[PDB]
Design a protein around this motif. Structure first.
Motif, PDB file in Angstrom:
ATOM      1  N   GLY A   1      -3.420   6.169   3.402  1.00 18.72           N
ATOM      2  CA  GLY A   1      -3.826   4.917   2.754  1.00 18.72           C
ATOM      3  C   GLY A   1      -2.927   3.722   2.999  1.00 18.72           C
TER       4      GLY A   1
ATOM      5  N   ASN B   1      -7.291   1.794   3.333  1.00 23.42           N
ATOM      6  CA  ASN B   1      -6.293   1.950   2.306  1.00 23.42           C
ATOM      7  C   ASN B   1      -6.809   2.706   1.073  1.00 23.42           C
ATOM      8  OD1 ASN B   1      -5.769  -1.258   3.506  1.00 23.42           O
ATOM      9  ND2 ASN B   1      -4.198   0.327   3.749  1.00 23.42           N
TER      10      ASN B   1
ATOM     11  N   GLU C   1       0.817  -1.207   0.000  1.00 26.10           N
ATOM     12  CA  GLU C   1       0.000   0.000   0.000  1.00 26.10           C
ATOM     13  C   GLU C   1       0.870   1.286   0.000  1.00 26.10           C
ATOM     14  OE1 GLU C   1      -3.089  -0.103  -0.702  1.00 26.10           O
ATOM     15  OE2 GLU C   1      -3.312  -2.312  -0.596  1.00 26.10           O
TER      16      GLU C   1
ATOM     17  N   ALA D   1      -6.360   1.203  -4.166  1.00 26.29           N
ATOM     18  CA  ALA D   1      -5.511   0.452  -3.223  1.00 26.29           C
ATOM     19  C   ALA D   1      -4.481  -0.399  -4.004  1.00 26.29           C
ATOM     20  CB  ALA D   1      -6.349  -0.427  -2.285  1.00 26.29           C
ATOM     21  N   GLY D   2      -3.326  -0.656  -3.403  1.00 27.02           N
ATOM     22  CA  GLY D   2      -2.347  -1.512  -4.090  1.00 27.02           C
ATOM     23  C   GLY D   2      -2.971  -2.885  -4.395  1.00 27.02           C
TER      24      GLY D   2
HETATM   25  K     K Z   1      -3.265   2.657  -0.446  1.00 25.01           K
END
Ligand code: K
Ligand code: K
Ligand code: K
Ligand code: K
Lengths: 455, 455, 455, 455
Positions: free
Chosen positions: B51, B261, A68, A294-295
């Motif tokens: 995040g 996140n 993240e 988000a990642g």
């Molecule tokens: K993030």
């Protein structure tokens, strides 16, 4: 004719299975507007094919490996190299979904007063074009506007029309061609490789840019493999890569053909446009290294896009939608033809010839379907078209339809039979379906929250 | 003084633990720009508090219950009830993160040429105001601009400046007051309840709207609880609810105080503005029933905002940041004071007084910090300020800082010791830190991709 | 006749979809033994209905809330309350799966030389009885042994045989009655409530204990609901609770009807036996507060047992298996009748009447089925029966079957069609199926690793 | 002296943070027995280091890729090849946890009347030995029985004692040597490579087998790297592999050093023992292809064992436990020495010299700790020792201890300070701790459910 699901069920989503009399109460509480129904009260939800896809076990493993970091995430690197490999563009900017990429492209690629020409349009795509000063010009072939005509590659651009726009307006006054695959408004109709090639060849000669609206490009690639001569020894991946080789960039919604519940991206080849894109993404979406995702979602989208390249997966996807259409057509139920990649559209005008368009046959048919089966569908007719704010009259669209939109990897052929059997049963006593009247109408976005009662 | 973590570790993120010599090679491959480092090469990543938060087991359970319906999702209803309960606003529109809410607010609430006045500003927030025709006016107390001044509630608005603006410009010419909690630009400084009340009372008397930039409202509530007389018997939840009672709505980033996140939302009380916001959200974000978020993220944000109300959680959050600042200050390291809620800012001008601003002391100090500890920090100085397009000269900011930004629930006091001890050792031989010069400079967004070498 | 799946697909398990020629090579690498195939090479895996179930989103949410405490876990308390509510027993001891519960029961309840009588038997269940000094007596009705006889409640105990045992051996010499629901060895045959009541009444009169082997008690409850007069207005939960009211306790495998991948438990009413069971569980399984299970699995099993009570779920479960059996029977394929709750058993003796049992018709038929469809099935015939150690001759079982065992919530009717159509095509040219001979035979557990070639 | 955590926090486990007066009520409701406390009421749970480990993001990704096939699971293949690589044995049989592997080994490797000699014992390990007819002989060095003696490798076998057993009983009458790493009963004390080598050399000469009880073999490998001369250039992996090269097989609990919440396995080199092991596992655990574990758990255990080989991870693990011991010893608190790999043991007899052993100082100290800090510890003293069933007297153990057992990767140094500071504070007024008396005592397993009140 119809292959079994090329996967197993890993986990299920529980449903309530409430009976007819209870569904009638829910439908009434929703003022007979399927858009107002609660998800928890719905057995089979065909409101949209956007963002409701079932992800795989491998995508869920990816979901646990979210990195993240604000910049330099392993998940951003994976998405970037996956899109570079499969679509073949130099640069990628993630966005939270497709209309975020549209916002950026239209701000970067249009001078006020220029034309954007495309094969029909989508609401958000065209809004961003016009907001930035473009005049929209429809250059789809005339047949695409005939909803009953059964022809292949019905989404193709009419090359003569492109030529006339060039002749009459001048190439320097055309911002870009927006070529969509598949074409949503015609019912999900594919575009041929021959057409994408010819459009590239004519625009390149005039120095005109081409950007794809690519949200269902894999469905499109499947129609090419199935029906375009010369493509039978080609993989889905090979077809997808050649498709994009005829474009300067694209806007993509992962929520459609990348098999995810959120995500999108903007691609381009030009370095200067990439630099400009990176400064603008920061304002609307986030840093160029995550773009409002988000990642874990960049990771899921990278994995999903690659899963979509599997022949058996996309063959089953399209043939499952085809099964529903075939079963309805075999019973004489009127539908948009040929069936498209992602949905079947019922012709509610023909289904309910005993009703006038002012009695809202599409809105009412959608209500009837939910009550009789637990299936939700979308009104795409007079209600969604809205009211003329000058005259106070309905905009009266030619198409008065109910969309049965199919999320990827969520439903079985037995769910398709629940849907078809109920519609067929309704069709046998089609005259019993009652007209609707407004009891509450918002000035704007009326399809979303309007309430009705039976006439 | 410093409480233990009021939670246990449920799962860990594995790191490589590469030694100094290998970090030096990674720093060199990144051109001595920390923004260019790979996440996989970093031990402790303090680039941002946005995040990167660690979610709870309960939030992860909610992540498995995503109801991905286009409208009527259980996750939407849960987010909506939660924000109505805790913030006290009538209406909520989800957005994919905070700047998506800002885009909507500024389009809805500003007529070209009107003023927007606030307690300092944030980059995206002010951009969206200005893009829509507002002129920004800073109404923070003068003391806020003195980075060395240790005073409570340093984020407070100067009622006398607010008053002057109304008198000189006319109420009808003020679009709204943008009150931020906490104030990021001053180092994360809180605003007092007394200030929030006085601003509401003055604006209300003239019919002026107040909208909060609320991203760190919970950290802010903690300071009020700790330091404002009268708030000792009040819960964090009671303080948050009273805070928002003095506003007409807010823009929120879940990525900060809601412990997620991705995610944000827009709140307002006015029925008419809500209807307009729903029309606009569809073109930029998504339907009002999901607003550019997966159902699972609406769920994780609803759960995380409620977790943020736990007294022990936020006390620990803020006191962990304080621990880092206290340890640095005790060694004589120059920092922005008092330490704010989410970060510690190093005064790189003072730290590297042997360098000129032209030699990039903040950029160089952040590089040294990575090499010596495996800690990533953000340049917030002359590099991030950019170059003047008109003149070609650097913008030379008063604040030449390195930001040690702390994600919530990710790190321990032992990690804070790695950060502090490495900085303290560097400070003891600060004269040895070398200046940097560009070897590659982008025309736009230079801080993201510029590369350097030592002088 | 055949209901649609009363759930949606939440996530999928990806499969390779390798074609016939590649499957033939995999079958050859496995020595024509389906037990030796790799899971990654199989499309539809019907080797077992044990522990391969698809969990729900709600169960997956519970998986993220594992309270891994050695004693006092919230997950233990939830499992305990749930089993007390639904099964009606006083005490519960978790075990890692069903045979762990059997080990405890047989050690606690049997004095060497006593008899244990039941409706047929299962391998692990009878082993644990015999290892502790019991002599097994079969008290199932004679009809159960006639695999072709189509009668309801074929699993019923013969009260006359139970009666004879008591008269000839003495009540004090009977350790307990082991009543199984459903009866696996007869093909998954249900037991009627009337039978369960009569057995309780007779045993109680003599002071004899009854313990249920309960692994498919929910499938059993469905048959009672569907076919036993008087049960039409009763819920599955009411039927399950009444079933267990006629027992002193039970051994349960969660891996079957509790819809999980691992888990089981032991139930009893007697306080003294509970205390003894707690002493023994610590040495074989774990503390009484977890019994060889992770907290998250106690949680997933508590949730899954409650989901199993949903009428639509279990109706669909049993009718899916029935669909497969009906389709095979209609084509003349010989199967064990009537079709049971969890599987369809092919009579390979009859299917391959051209082969002798010495040529392994069940082993060969299961091999053909994999090659032709990508479906794995289990040999349950002469190979699995083993060789006589004393004489060196094959044990020649009356049942020479291939088991098509169906995991819960994993497959569709389309998958059932892949299975049936491939078997039906093989049946039409059954004479062409070749006999097998050993090329490698283990001394023990030969079915697990033996290798073969065609004669 | 004390490294920071070599990982970040990915997710957290929420805790209630109930204050002292509420904790006193919970402790009373639990009859002053920490074994009866509810997990939801505990801040820091140091009851056990078994099965409460925090898994990584990579393990959780593995958890989503469970291949739940009865045979041929990808997860079984991964575990098998991981254990073959890292431990170096030919054959692996999974079991649900360590005592399942012990059950199999003891049934396979002991003839009634033979001796099993080991370095002290563990309860389940020794039970399975004796249940199968072995006589246990303790061959640990004499120093290991002196709890205050600070010597290195205190778990070593006394070679002279091994020689005498061989001399007096004859090699053919010794089933095997059971060598444990670390030695739990002496407080987690390591065994040197020199000792493992010498034991292998003497037993091999006599044809005697050696099996490890290997549950904390990685902790052990760390002590060898830190303290045994010649091992400073060796990796943890290299040390682990050489360790096992001196054994014929092992029993392993994944719940300790493999970083999982469930799982174990049996290893051996001998083919005939492997064949026998496979026939027996079926009875107690499940097929040799899953051994009483879900596929996802074989995967998590395979990933966790490999994570354990990282030097920084195991260094921090052991030094975190050491920190707690060092801080207690620095304050004069009496503890078992030297501190072991997984726990600190308080000497409750010395802590409470004002109490007799019959007033249960360990049980009472554990109660006091929870009330004052929210920390749970285990009684390992007179209560756990049980009552002599012939004489009716307490078994009076020499060791009267409270175990502070540390799960892996769950807690921080700040949690360690909560624990130490509270114990130190109690120690300063040690005389105030009150004696306990039984108010309810079970005949068996009394530590688990006994209840007390203050004298
Ligand atoms: K993030
Ligand atoms: K969605
Ligand atoms: K399983
Ligand atoms: K556990």
């Amino acid at each position: 004719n119809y292959p079994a699901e090329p996967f197993r069920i890993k986990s299920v989503e529980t449903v309530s299975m409430i009976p007819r009399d209870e569904r009638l109460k829910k439908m009434q509480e929703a003022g007979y507007n399927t858009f107002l129904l609660n998800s928890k009260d719905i057995y089979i939800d065909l409101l949209t094919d956007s963002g409701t896809n079932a992800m795989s076990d491998k995508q869920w493993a990816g979901m646990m490996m979210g990195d993240e970091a604000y910049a330099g995430s392993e998940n951003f690197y994976h998405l970037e190299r996956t899109v570079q490999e499969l679509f073949g563009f130099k640069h990628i900017v993630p966005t939270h979904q497709g209309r975020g990429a549209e916002n950026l492209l239209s701000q970067l690629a249009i001078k006020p007063g220029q034309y954007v020409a495309g094969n029909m349009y989508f609401t958000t795509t065209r809004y961003h074009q016009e907001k930035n000063g473009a005049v929209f010009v429809d250059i789809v072939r005339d047949e695409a506007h005939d909803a009953g005509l059964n022809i292949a590659f019905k989404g193709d651009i009419d090359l003569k029309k492109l030529q006339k726009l060039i002749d009459e307006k001048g190439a320097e006054n055309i911002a870009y061609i927006c070529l969509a695959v598949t074409v949503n408004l015609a019912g999900g109709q594919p575009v041929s490789m021959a057409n994408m090639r010819a459009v590239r060849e004519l625009t390149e000669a005039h120095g005109i840019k081409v950007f794809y609206d690519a949200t269902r490009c894999v469905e499109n690639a499947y129609f090419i493999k199935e029906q375009e001569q010369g493509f039978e020894n080609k993989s889905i991946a090979e077809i997808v890569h050649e498709m994009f080789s005829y474009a300067d960039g694209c806007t993509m919604s992962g929520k459609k053909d990348c098999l995810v519940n959120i995500g999108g991206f903007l691609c381009m080849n030009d370095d200067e446009m990439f630099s400009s894109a990176k400064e603008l993404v920061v304002v609307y979406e986030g840093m160029p290294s995550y773009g409002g995702l988000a990642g874990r979602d960049m990771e899921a989208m990278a994995i999903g896009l690659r899963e979509a390249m599997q022949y058996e997966y996309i063959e089953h996807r399209v043939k499952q939608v085809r099964y529903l259409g075939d079963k309805l057509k075999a019973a004489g139920v009127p539908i948009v033809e040929p069936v498209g990649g992602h949905a079947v559209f019922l012709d509610a005008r023909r289904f309910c010839e005993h009703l006038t368009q002012d009695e809202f046959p599409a809105q009412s048919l959608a209500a009837s379907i939910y009550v009789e089966t637990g299936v939700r569908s979308m009104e795409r007719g007079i209600i969604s078209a809205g009211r003329n704010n000058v005259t106070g009259e309905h905009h009266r669209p030619k198409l008065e339809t109910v969309r049965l939109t199919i999320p990827r990897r969520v439903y079985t052929y037995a769910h398709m039979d629940v849907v078809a059997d109920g519609i067929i049963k309704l069709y046998q006593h089609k005259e019993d379906i009652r007209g609707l009247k407004f009891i509450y109408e918002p000035k704007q976005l009326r399809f979303f929250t309007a309430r009705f009662d039976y006439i």
